[PDB]
Each structure stands twice: as structure tokens, then as C-alpha cells.
Enzyme design. Structure first.
Site, PDB file in Angstrom:
ATOM      1  N   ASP A   1       7.182 -28.996  -4.454  1.00 64.15           N
ATOM      2  CA  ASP A   1       6.138 -29.818  -3.848  1.00 64.15           C
ATOM      3  C   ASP A   1       5.301 -29.016  -2.840  1.00 64.15           C
ATOM      4  OD1 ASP A   1       4.562 -32.075  -3.484  1.00 64.15           O
ATOM      5  OD2 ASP A   1       6.004 -33.117  -2.189  1.00 64.15           O
TER       6      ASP A   1
ATOM      7  N   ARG B   1      -0.326 -30.042   2.798  1.00 64.23           N
ATOM      8  CA  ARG B   1       0.154 -31.240   3.500  1.00 64.23           C
ATOM      9  C   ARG B   1       1.660 -31.174   3.811  1.00 64.23           C
ATOM     10  NH1 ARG B   1      -0.699 -32.618  -1.859  1.00 64.23           N
ATOM     11  NH2 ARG B   1       1.323 -32.871  -2.909  1.00 64.23           N
TER      12      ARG B   1
END
Ligand SMILES: Cn1cc(Nc2ncc(C3CN(C(=O)Nc4ccc(-c5ccccc5)cc4)C3)nc2C(N)=O)cn1
Ligand SMILES: [Cl-]
Ligand SMILES: [Cl-]
Length: 283
Positions: free
Chosen positions: A144, A148
Site C-alpha cells: 500500500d 498518503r
């Protein structure tokens, strides 16, 4: 709830403050961790089937990570919601500045941090490559990696974070499959889009996307391209375009992360050296 690695922190030592972020799979909250000497410490709390013992073992393994560019897990607290159900809570150090993606956007406002110089942008990428090189050595797949999910420390160094979808290579992954299928498609390697199967070369592809996010100061990848078209788009050979004022050398480092054959992409150690050399060659 055997806890052989002693990763669990007594729930009585933690008071939940204000909510910082809320998503489909949990939330991030402020908190105070009453240390043994009575002093409360500022911490962040991540809240959320498979045997919870496996969650604690993964948490214990991440608690042993010792790298300045990798977030350090403090412990795990277990909460009993509704009718006796164990719900783990990841205790992390509190990081004032928040995530790198939001920070880049804020920097484009008069009130935010000043205009980020190119050398500072390139230093953010080196920091991420160093953290990813460390995780890569330990056989950890992040799965991932995005701006962010990179946190800014108080001394302005970046650390890789958000290990909720991580997996040690060869380890079990069945109870993560449902969450993996809902991952943002614009960071996923062409070969991983087909059945959502990842390798360390999938993280290398996402690191190039993360570099492009930093170089554009927070733009969403592939403007003009919708999520449902992403697979067809990459299948036709198209890649992220060169950002304005991005050095041709830097863009070549990003483009190497998106080669169709995963074996042709470089390793994090190669990328890291190329970015450190590129950074050294500048005023
Ligand atoms: C507006 N604002 C927000 C903030 N601060 C934050 N906001 C977001 C986050 C992200 C949550 N992160 C993270 O690592 N989660 C994570 C790590 C490990 C595991 C896991 C799962 C299974 C097994 C082992 C481990 C699960 C999740 C980073 N952290 C902070 C912070 N630390 O201060 C400041 N201002
Ligand atoms: Cl693009
Ligand atoms: Cl281009």
C-alpha cells in the site's frame, strides 16, 4: 490472547482523545499513554475472522523494526465492543505534521509550509527508498505504498507507515484478501492488477508512483484517466507523464519502476543509490 512476544499494552493505560481520520476499515485517534512513572505520552491510535494471536505476532515483528525511515509500533491494546469481541488497536508515536500527501497539498497554499524546493522533494524520496530498502531486506511487502501512507516526523524526515495490508513473503494472507481487493488501483503494478498478487517489484512500481506524487506536489496519478480504465491504459504501454520542472534524470528513475516485466525494475537499493547520487550532484 497468550501474547508470547509481550506486545500488548494494558488498556487501562490508554485514554482516547480526538478523532484525526476516519475510513471504511477503521480510524486514527489522538491518545495518552500513561507511562510507568505516571507521565502521559502523546500517541496515535489505529482502530479496526482470523485468530487475533496472528495479529499480535505481526505487531510484535513490526515493534522490532529499527530504522529512522520506518514508523515504530509502540504496542497493541485490545477493546471489547458490543458483545465480547476482541478488537486490536495499534499504538503509534504521535506525528504532528501528519501524512506527506496532505503536507504537499498544504505547501501549495500561502498558509501552509513554504514552497518545497526540488532538493527537499528529492530528499523525501531518498527517505522513502531507505525505509523501503530496510523493509525489502526483512522480506516485508508493504502492498500500500503511497504518499498518503508516509508520515512526517517532527524533524521533517519521512517514514513509511500504514502496515495494515503488509505481509511477510511466504506468510499466510487469506484474511487480508477482502481488503486487498479494495485497494486504490492507481498505485497497483500492471501484473498485480489481474488477480491482486504482489511481489517486492509491486512495491517498486508503487514507489515510482509515490515519487511522481511528490514531484507533482500531491496530484492524483493519471489525470484524465478513470479508475475503471487503468488496466487497459497500462496494457497499452502508457505510463505517468513527466511532471513540470522534473529533472530528466529523476523522471528516468521513476520510469524504471514501471517496466512491464517486474524483473526489469530495479531494487530499492539500486533506486536509493541513484536518488542519493542525483541529490549529491545538486547545489
Ligand atoms: C491529521 N493528523 C493525523 C495525524 N497523525 C497520524 N495520522 C495517521 C497515521 C497513520 C496510521 N498509521 C499506521 O502506521 N498504521 C498502522 C500501522 C501498523 C498496523 C499493523 C497492522 C497489523 C499488524 C501490525 C501492525 C496497522 C496500521 C500511520 N498516523 C498518525 C500518527 N502516527 O501520528 C496527525 N495529524
Ligand atoms: Cl500522467
Ligand atoms: Cl511525458
Amino acid at each position: 490472547a497468550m501474547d508470547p512476544e509481550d506486545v500488548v499494552i494494558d488498556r487501562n493505560l490508554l485514554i482516547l482523545g480526538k478523532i484525526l481520520g476516519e475510513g471504511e476499515f477503521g480510524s486514527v485517534m489522538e491518545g495518552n499513554l500513561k507511562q510507568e512513572d505516571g507521565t502521559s505520552l502523546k500517541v496515535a491510535v489505529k482502530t479496526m475472522q482470523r485468530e487475533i494471536e496472528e495479529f499480535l505476532s505481526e505487531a510484535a515483528c513490526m515493534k522490532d523494526f529499527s530504522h529512522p525511515n520506518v514508523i515504530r509500533l509502540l504496542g497493541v491494546c485490545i477493546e471489547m465492543s458490543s458483545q465480547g469481541i476482541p478488537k486490536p488497536m495499534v499504538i503509534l508515536p504521535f506525528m504532528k505534521y501528519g501524512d506527506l500527501h496532505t503536507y504537499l497539498l498544504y505547501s501549495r497554499l500561502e498558509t501552509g509550509p513554504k514552497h518545497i524546493p526540488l532538493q527537499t522533494l528529492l530528499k523525501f524520496m531518498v527517505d522513502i527508498a531507505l525505509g523501503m530498502e530496510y523493509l525489502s531486506n526483512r522480506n516485508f511487502l508493504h502492498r500500500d505504498l503511497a504518499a498518503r501512507n508516509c508520515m512526517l516526523r517532527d524533524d521533517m524526515t519521512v517514514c513509511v507507515a500504514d502496515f495494515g495490508l503488509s505481509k511477510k513473503i511466504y506468510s499466510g494472507d487469506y484474511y487480508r484478501q477482502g481488503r486487498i481487493a479494495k485497494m486504490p488501483v492507481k498505485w497497483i503494478a500492471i501484473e498485480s492488477l489481474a488477480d491482486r498478487v504482489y511481489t517486492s517489484k509491486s512495491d517498486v512500481w508503487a514507489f515510482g508512483v509515490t515519487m511522481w506524487e511528490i514531484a507533482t506536489r500531491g496530484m492524483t496519478p493519471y489525470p484524465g484517466v478513470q479508475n475503471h480504465e487503468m488496466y487497459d491504459y497500462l496494457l497499452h504501454g502508457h505510463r505517468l507523464k513527466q511532471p513540470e520542472d522534473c529533472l530528466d534524470e529523476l523522471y528516468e528513475i521513476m520510469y524504471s519502476c514501471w517496466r512491464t516485466d517486474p524483473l526489469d525494475r530495479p531494487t530499492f537499493s539500486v533506486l536509493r543509490l541513484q536518488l542519493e547520487k542525483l541529490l549529491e550532484s545538486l547545489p
